[PDB]
Amino acid sequence: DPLPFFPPLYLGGPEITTENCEREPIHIPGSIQPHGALLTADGHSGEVLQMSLNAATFLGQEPTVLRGQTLAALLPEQWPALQAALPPGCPDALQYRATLDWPAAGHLSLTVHRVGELLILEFEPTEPHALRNAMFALESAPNLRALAEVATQTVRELTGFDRVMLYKFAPDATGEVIAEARREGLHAFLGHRFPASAIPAQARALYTRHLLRLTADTRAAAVPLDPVLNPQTNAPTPLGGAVLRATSPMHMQYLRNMGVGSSLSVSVVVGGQLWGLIACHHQTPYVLPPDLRTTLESLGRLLSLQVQVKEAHHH
Amino acid sequence: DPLPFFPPLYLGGPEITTENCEREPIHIPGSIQPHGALLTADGHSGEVLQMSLNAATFLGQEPTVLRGQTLAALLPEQWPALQAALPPGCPDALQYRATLDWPAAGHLSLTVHRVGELLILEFEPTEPHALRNAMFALESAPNLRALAEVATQTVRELTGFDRVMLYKFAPDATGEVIAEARREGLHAFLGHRFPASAIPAQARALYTRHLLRLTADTRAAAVPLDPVLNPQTNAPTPLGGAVLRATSPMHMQYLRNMGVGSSLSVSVVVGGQLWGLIACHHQTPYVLPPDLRTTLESLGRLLSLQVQVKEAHHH
Numbered sequence: 091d092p093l094p095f096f097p098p099l100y101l102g103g104p105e106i107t108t109e110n111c112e113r114e115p116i117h118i119p120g121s122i123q124p125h126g127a128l129l130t131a132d133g134h135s136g137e138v139l140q141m142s143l144n145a146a147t148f149l150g151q152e153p154t155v156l157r158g159q160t161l162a163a164l165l166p167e168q169w170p171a172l173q174a175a176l177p178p179g180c181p182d183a184l185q186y187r188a189t190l191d192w193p194a195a196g197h198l199s200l201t202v203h204r205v206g207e208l209l210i211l212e213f214e215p216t217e218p219h220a221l222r223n224a225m226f227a228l229e230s231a232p233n234l235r236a237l238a239e240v241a242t243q244t245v246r247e248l249t250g251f252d253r254v255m256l257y258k259f260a261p262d263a264t265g266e267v268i269a270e271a272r273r274e275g276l277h278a279f280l281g282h283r284f285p286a287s288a289i290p291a292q293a294r295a296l297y298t299r300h301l302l303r304l305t306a307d308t309r310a311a312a313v314p315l316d317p318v319l320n321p322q323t324n325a326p327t328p329l330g331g332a333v334l335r336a337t338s339p340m341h342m343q344y345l346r347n348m349g350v351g352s353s354l355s356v357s358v359v360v361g362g363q364l365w366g367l368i369a370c371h372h373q374t375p376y377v378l379p380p381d382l383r384t385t386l387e388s389l390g391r392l393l394s395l396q397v398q399v400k401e402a403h404h405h
Numbered sequence: 406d407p408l409p410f411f412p413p414l415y416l417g418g419p420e421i422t423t424e425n426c427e428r429e430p431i432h433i434p435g436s437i438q439p440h441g442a443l444l445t446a447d448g449h450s451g452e453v454l455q456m457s458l459n460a461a462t463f464l465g466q467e468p469t470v471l472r473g474q475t476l477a478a479l480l481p482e483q484w485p486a487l488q489a490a491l492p493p494g495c496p497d498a499l500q501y502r503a504t505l506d507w508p509a510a511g512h513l514s515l516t517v518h519r520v521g522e523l524l525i526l527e528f529e530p531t532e533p534h535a536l537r538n539a540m541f542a543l544e545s546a547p548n549l550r551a552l553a554e555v556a557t558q559t560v561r562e563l564t565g566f567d568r569v570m571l572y573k574f575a576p577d578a579t580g581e582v583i584a585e586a587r588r589e590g591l592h593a594f595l596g597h598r599f600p601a602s603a604i605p606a607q608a609r610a611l612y613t614r615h616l617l618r619l620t621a622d623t624r625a626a627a628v629p630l631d632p633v634l635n636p637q638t639n640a641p642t643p644l645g646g647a648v649l650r651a652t653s654p655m656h657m658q659y660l661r662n663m664g665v666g667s668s669l670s671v672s673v674v675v676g677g678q679l680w681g682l683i684a685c686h687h688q689t690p691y692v693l694p695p696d697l698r699t700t701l702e703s704l705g706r707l708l709s710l711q712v713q714v715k716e717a718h719h720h
């Protein structure tokens with residue numbers, strides 16, 4: 091049970107320190123990472139309610155001009171499908187995904203989820219068999235630690251990340267790196283233990299519900315949403331289900347201090363509890379493409395189940 | 406433990422009947438389904454050793470002219486990768502996959518696996534997020550039967566198959582349909598039980614090792630390989646790892662008698678034992694594309710693990 095949140099800084103909340111980091115409202119930063127754009131919309135009317143300030147970079151119309159327009163006008167082809175895919179009351183982790191044309195190279199990937207009566211739309215530029223292959227070595231791994239070793243190697247191979255760790259939580263929420271795949275020459279974190287405060291309780295709770303999060307560029311400034319509050323509620327917009335959610339500034343400083351240029355992790359959830367993380371670092375900024383992120387989510391699921399099976403036959 | 410095999414018909418084996426069907430050598434039919442082409446090659450030299458007789462339809466050179474040519478000549482780009490992907494001693498279920506250009510519409514999908522010192526190459530014309538989405542309802546299913554119901558619905562949605570069943574094996578190898586998703590108007594098989602002989606012991610044993618098999622057109626005549634025997638061994642070529650493997654004629658007659666035009670199943674393997682099948686029927690011929698088959702293999706894996714978890718919490 092994490093403490094009550096601070097108000098976010100845009101509601102006059104206090105500054106975060108190492109003495110109160112467990113109270114930062116990381117699920118409502120009111121801003122996104124700059125490598126994509128985000129809109130929110132009324133889940134019945136499809137009226138656009140909020141827009142990231144960088145929307146015209148990705149969507150080609152000004153945020154103030156998009157505001158109030160319907161997704162039926164904006165996304166004629168996708169709106170019926172979107173609407174049917176994400177009915178009121180559906181899980182906030184359920185996603186609608188489509189690919190959109192745009193004047194630039196590649197395409198625009200659209201990812202949508204629903205929170206209450208709000209649709210949250212994420213747009214990012216983009217220019218499974220290996221998963222399938224991997225499941226053999228994951229299945230044949232003789233025990234938990236062997237599974238962990240295979241899993242980190244597989245993820246490195248899929249992603250090209252400089253470092254991939256499987257971080258395991260202890261009952262006191264301290265953690266240990268129990269497996270690591272890394273580029274030659276990088277110093278090892280294998281076996282290193284870290285205190286519970288490295289991943290504070292409100293983060294652990296969010297990561298139990300929304301199983302993948304990332305920081306594409308640990309030096310990139312966040313982009314505010316406008317208006318910052320959801321008009322439906324006159325309250326902050328929950329962004330925990332959006333990969334574009336801005337990362338805690340305190341965690342980004344931690345990553346920079348570590349010499350990390352990009353970070354990504356996937357939760358390993360067993361019996362509804364956070365068991366650990368597949369934790370990835372790159373030395374430079376890196377936008378993992380949406381199809382590869384989807385594959386990592388799927389491996390996270392598969393790994394969660396295999397952990398539960400490998401641990402059981404120790405009983 | 407299945408009985409010893411009959412020799413295949415091309416080695417003077419006896420005709421199959423309902424009294425001896427458990428002895429049909431289904432893994433070595435010496436022939437393929439006609440919607441693709443197959444080559445085999447020496448795993449060191451890449452010399453082509455065998456060719457399906459229909460190769461020129463898909464590859465544009467005569468089988469007798471391909472024979473003896475190296476994959477380095479035939480597939481310059483892919484051969485180093487192929488070779489590195491499938492080293493001697495690797496699992497015979499491990500696959501290399503690539504997409505090839507050809508003069509026709511779409512592309513040519515290449516799938517390769519290794520059996521001993523033989524590479525087996527399958528070529529078929531072709532013109533994951535839904536998987537990811539599905540895992541939520543699979544995870545939230547409260548028990549085994551609910552999981553089964555979600556799984557058959559998901560597979561129907563992914564594939565558009567007229568009927569999708571989860572067939573569960575009993576300890577005496579009889580089976581029961583414990584879940585079914587079907588097009589409106591189709592009579593139900595839900596709850597129906599079938600004798601052990603419907604899926605004979607040598608089939609059950611193959612399906613424990615090679616987890617997906619299909620009959621794209623239950624009226625299509627098989628296409629012989631040439632030469633029919635692998636020159637390395639002067640013995641039949643094992644095709645259980647090739648989806649293009651010709652289906653037992655006895656099973657194809659069964660499917661036609663059932664009014665099935667296309668069939669596909671995926672094994673559910675738990676603790677190394679065959680627990681059951683995701684069994685799919687279409688009323689007409691249907692070539693499920695290779696990327697969708699790959700997705701079904703991945704769901705089969707995930708379902709196997711979830712079955713094991715849902716059944717355990719009954720203990």
Ligand SMILES: *C/C=C1/C(=C/c2[nH]c(/C=C3[NH+]=C(/C=C4\NC(=O)C(C=C)=C4C)C(C)=C\3CCC(=O)O)c(CCC(=O)O)c2C)NC(=O)[C@H]1C
Pocket residue numbers: 107108109110111112114116279284287288289290293303304305336337338340341344353354355367369370371
């Ligand atoms: C008092 C505040 C601090 C704090 C806040 C914080 N930390 C996170 C999220 C993560 N911290 C992680 C820690 C590690 N990464 C590593 O590589 C290692 C060791 C090799 C450790 C211990 C990780 C993995 C995460 C998850 C995010 C990610 O994968 O990059 C948050 C939440 C961030 C967010 O989602 O917005 C916060 C608020 N961390 C501290 O150490 C103290 C100073």
Ligand SMILES: *C/C=C1/C(=C/c2[nH]c(/C=C3[NH+]=C(/C=C4\NC(=O)C(C=C)=C4C)C(C)=C\3CCC(=O)O)c(CCC(=O)O)c2C)NC(=O)[C@H]1C
Pocket residue numbers: 422423424425426427429431594599602603604605608618619620651652653655656659668669670682684685686
């Ligand atoms: C004595 C020989 C017979 C026999 C041989 C046989 N059967 C199979 C494979 C399968 N049989 C299946 C049975 C069913 N499909 C259904 O829909 C239902 C009920 C609704 C049943 C009972 C299934 C599912 C398979 C797997 C293949 C597939 O999914 O289509 C084989 C092996 C075929 C092969 O891989 O080459 C053989 C030799 N089956 C009999 O009933 C007796 C007459």
